[PDB]
Design a binder for this molecule. Structure first.
Ligand SMILES: CCCCCC[C@@H]1NC[C@@H](O)[C@H](O)[C@H]1C(=O)O
Ligand SMILES: CCCCCC[C@@H]1NC[C@@H](O)[C@H](O)[C@H]1C(=O)O
Lengths: 620, 620
């Protein structure tokens, strides 16, 4: 279950397989299996980690449907592999993959945004090894994210009443038809690596939790005493594990020796005096060092953690007992050449932009991000809402057992990967599923999501609040959203409805706010905004102008400032990003307050000035 | 002398040190040395590899002058380090660096675009190692690239006659003053890695040359026989090395065992029947495998190479005996977030754009590029002119011994690194130095550059032609350029002079062409173009419009097509790129035929159509 990021130390080594691989496109529903047996014929170059779609302008890889095949060779010294457990890890392959090593099928995986690995100890040999990876980009009615098995893409224009259109449609080239508003970037989007552990016994998983804080300082910089718990899982085979707690300076401030009891497991609690707490805008990280004992050490792992509590109380969101207010946006892993490919330079920059904006948070819309970004936010004091790729869902999916299982696969997987990050304060189990309507549809939606709500709570040792991001719907017939720990709403009053009329938009908003006032749950925006082309200006700003985008946030935020139970504003979006082409997408989605190149539109400056005057704690 | 790229095989392992490091700014001319002794205080994150300048929007790192300090920790299993020679390699640190390991100064390096390494075998220890790297971005009268010690930036504006301006200047914040037109991106721009070799004896360098081709086929796909030479250098300490030549399928097609004689060296020749030649647009690569013999193998290195000849004959540039014509551009390593940071995704994409454009070549303006790009061009059949960072030079530099030595270091270093790449057909020893004028100035320039021309020839075992890229000058008083193997000229008739008048530009051009016609050397463009803002249009295109850029190349190329001795068109630039700010730089240099995001302007489409109709061989 544990999927600790591969680590190098005295017991373990990591061998990265990133770089420029060989690459071929294949078929709509197949690929040549014999390609795993020998070097790819006439291969293209393809850098990895990265989406393949924008790495070859001779081809139209954005239009590709079906399989592609990656391949490379590598060689490692025999003295490294001797007596070690050898693991091949894929941080992400989007969306599905078959993996071959030296002609042997290692296995397969579905889920484009969570890591998977294989024990390759017996599959490796000396000299050059041949690694072949087939990647499938197809989406449909049983995938997460959800595709349409027929019809149009989201927000799609159609003239079905024309006979000629209906006929041409039946013979059109097959394409992925997303039920979501971001381009279907595919391939080896994140790192690939080989790593080693000891074979006889090894650390397989670690969970650290903040159980209780005693006497938190007025500024919440410290607690007189903090009780943390550990749970270490072992694989392999009077054994013990040593656990050392390191402060920010590397000074061991606590240490205990725990018994391993059989799924070998060691667990217990540790008290930390005058513990330094993790807060938004004021991060502090400790290291839990686990060392498996035989002065020699058998195995070791260093796990970063932060000491903080998260608790919903009434209409407040408490971090270290203080009333928090979210300032931020939904993001995307999206950039030009890389597509959805992970880029830590850009991740480092984006975190700096978040500070520049005086935001304090974001949501991983609409999929778990690369692991390195969570590490980055841990040390930079940025709060995260962590979200599974359950986007584009409706009643057709709720009746499908395969979807329910893939959805459970996403939640346990996300939480298994991300549980130790202090920056994560809440889980999101879906973005904009169908929740409303008449007859049995509301109850059907409820019955699908409630056990996923329970699963998220049961899976997280820290027991963080769980939410579901609600689309702009009939909130009076939706019976699911109001049962979440925090009500997270996506609203586009004045853009997709009452278009351009900000008075009417605010009037409509206030009517729904009057509704949520009575539900008595904490409420925040997770999306709102307006497409904006930088350089379009007006004295009286109309839709798509920079001025209108500024006016939009100015009018809307003035209304939510009047509601004490409204605990956060996360807009849409951080930056412009790529989408499937269509009549409402001007080179993608232009609702970013920054351009795709991370340059600030007028609204960004206005939001920066606003957020500078709003404290992380005690605003409401 | 040798700088083989680190390789993993049964005798060798590479441990990458890339990732998110710790980072602090320091002083204009110092940094706290005690930072090497302990973790950096309050560090920022900084991705490696990448320029640091665009990775933090809270700071103005583009305006930073002086030192910065990088730091990270790392640990490797003791059993892997055991008995091995341990090498720490920096692919590039721009511009100068002091490197510390565990508080010990390892040494320093000047030169921002070439790799350097340290033997750290004795500095390493078990557990966490602390790696601290100080990087100096400062440029001046003694650096390559050349900076100004006072005054303005390249094409910088001033009103020196105003007393108020003169005074304020003396109190202005100190800044790097480049004598070049690209932004001074700095930091750990390329990869950092630790690698191992055998300690007792190891391969230190490998050089492969194509000595002679016998009976080349009409299409130059093959030669009846190819005579290649190898030269292997060893370090450490009747010993022998086995050399196997692998074809594109991995089949050993030739093999010899050579004796090692002590400066341990093995050298000889190998005849290959029906050898497959490397050509532009039709690459073929062999592998030279060298194995140090004790059936066991001591050490091994696999060196890719290609079999082709390059010869300047009269006014022709012969590759495998056929008259080649350059189609291409000067490039830059430049992109939005990475700066000058290497990005293999972008390199793969750019290589595809070159094919899309039907170009066949480019120049590494104005510095050696990342090693991976040459590997990429080796397999994709793109020809390269390789250039050292000798840009911004004038008479003030020719009299400076430190500059002369740094210039020699770069020339020997570039060639030592890049000698084995078949894609490289020519060396460039400077871009736009001062060469013309009255008095002793022309002779002084000649006396400075002539021994560098000789050095490039002496350093290169393949003995490729050598050039110097000449600025738009008084070609009648210039006595240096005409002595190069190929005349490479940068001309901006109709842009920087005779502005907008294309009839007059072509008239002036033809006049300089009449001059070069008599010199009787082969001549090519290495720069020509016009700043162009995408989206600016006109029915009668004026400067900065997409139409003017198209008209510009159409009129100019029509004139050079009339000259049989004119053997190439490399324009400026491949893509828009970042510069120091100024009144002629609209968000950088806009002479790209592509935008900075790699999108094609009107001129790119026109050039694509023209180049599609121009063959690699026999156009002239
Ligand atoms: C009001 C009707 C529904 C609005 C839908 C708004 C959409 N939500 C989910 C995001 O992934 C989309 O990018 C966003 C949008 O189109 O910008
Ligand atoms: C006509 C004399 C001046 C020509 C100077 C042209 C310059 N050459 C070298 C390149 O690095 C510059 O970017 C280019 C330019 O400014 O775009």
């Amino acid at each position: 279950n544990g999927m600790l990021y591969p680590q190098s130390n005295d017991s373990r080594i990591v061998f990265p397989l990133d770089g420029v691989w060989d690459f071929r496109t294949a078929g709509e529903d197949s690929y040549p299996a014999e390609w795993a047996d020998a070097p790819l014929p006439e291969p293209l170059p393809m850098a990895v980690p990265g989406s393949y779609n924008d790495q070859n302008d001779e081809l139209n890889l954005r239009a590709h449907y079906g399989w592609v095949v990656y391949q490379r060779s590598f060689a490692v010294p025999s003295r490294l592999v001797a007596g070690q457990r050898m693991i091949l890890r894929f941080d992400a392959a989007t969306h599905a993959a078959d993996v071959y090593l030296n002609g042997q099928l290692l296995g397969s995986h579905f889920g484009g945004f969570l890591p998977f690995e294989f024990d390759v100890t017996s599959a490796l040999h000396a000299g050059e090894n041949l690694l072949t990876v087939a990647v499938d980009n197809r989406i449909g009615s049983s995938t997460l994210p959800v595709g349409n098995d027929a019809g149009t893409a989201f927000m799609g224009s159609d003239n079905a009443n024309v006979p000629a259109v209906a006929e041409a449609k039946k013979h059109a080239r097959r394409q992925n038809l997303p039920n979501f508003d971001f381009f279907n970037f595919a391939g080896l989007n994140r790192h690939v690596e080989l790593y080693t552990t000891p074979a006889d016994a090894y650390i397989a998983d670690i969970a650290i939790t903040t159980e209780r804080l005693d006497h938190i300082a007025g500024d919440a910089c410290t607690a007189a005493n903090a009780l943390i718990a550990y749970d270490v899982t072992f694989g392999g085979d009077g054994r013990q594990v040593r656990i050392s707690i390191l402060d920010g300076e590397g000074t061991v401030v606590a240490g205990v020796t725990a018994d391993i009891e059989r799924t070998a497991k060691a667990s217990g609690e540790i008290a930390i005096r005058d513990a330094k707490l993790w807060n938004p805008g004021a991060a502090y990280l400790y290291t839990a060092v686990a060392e498996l004992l035989p002065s020699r050490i058998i195995d070791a792992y260093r796990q970063t953690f932060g000491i903080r509590t998260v608790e919903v109380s009434g209409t407040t969101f408490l971090i270290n007992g203080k009333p928090f207010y979210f300032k931020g946006f939904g993001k995307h892993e999206d950039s030009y050449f890389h597509g959805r490919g992970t880029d830590d330079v850009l991740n480092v920059k984006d975190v700096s932009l978040i500070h520049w904006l005086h935001a304090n948070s974001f949501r991983t819309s609409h999929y778990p991000y690369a692991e390195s970004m969570y590490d980055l936010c841990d040390r930079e004091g940025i709060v995260i809402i962590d979200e599974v790729p359950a986007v584009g869902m409706s009643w057709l999916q709720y009746a499908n057992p395969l979807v329910a299982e893939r959805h459970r696969e996403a939640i346990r997987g996300m939480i298994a990967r991300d549980k130790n990050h202090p920056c994560i304060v809440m889980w999101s189990i879906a973005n904009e599923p169908g929740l409303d309507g008449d007859g049995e549809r509301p109850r059907q939606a409820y019955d699908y999501f409630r056990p996923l709500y329970e699963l998220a709570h049961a899976s997280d040792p820290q027991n963080r609040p769980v939410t579901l991001v609600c689309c702009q719907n009939d909130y009076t017939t939706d019976i699911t959203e109001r049962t979440m720990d925090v009500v997270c709403i996506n609203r586009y009053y004045g853009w997709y409805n009452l278009s351009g009329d900000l008075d009417a938009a605010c009037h409509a908003l206030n009517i729904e706010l009057d509704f949520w006032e009575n539900i008595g749950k904490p409420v925040m925006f997770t999306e709102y905004g307006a497409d904006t082309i930088e350089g379009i200006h007006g004295t009286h700003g109309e839709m798509f102008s920079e001025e209108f985008q500024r006016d939009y946030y100015a009018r809307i935020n003035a209304e939510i400032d009047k509601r004490p139970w409204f605990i956060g504003e996360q807009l849409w979006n951080f930056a412009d990003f790529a989408t499937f082409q269509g009549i409402i997408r001007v080179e993608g989605n232009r609702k970013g307050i920054l351009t795709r190149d991370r340059q600030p539109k007028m609204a960004a400056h206005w939001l920066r000035e606003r957020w500078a005057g709003i404290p992380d704690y005690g605003y409401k």
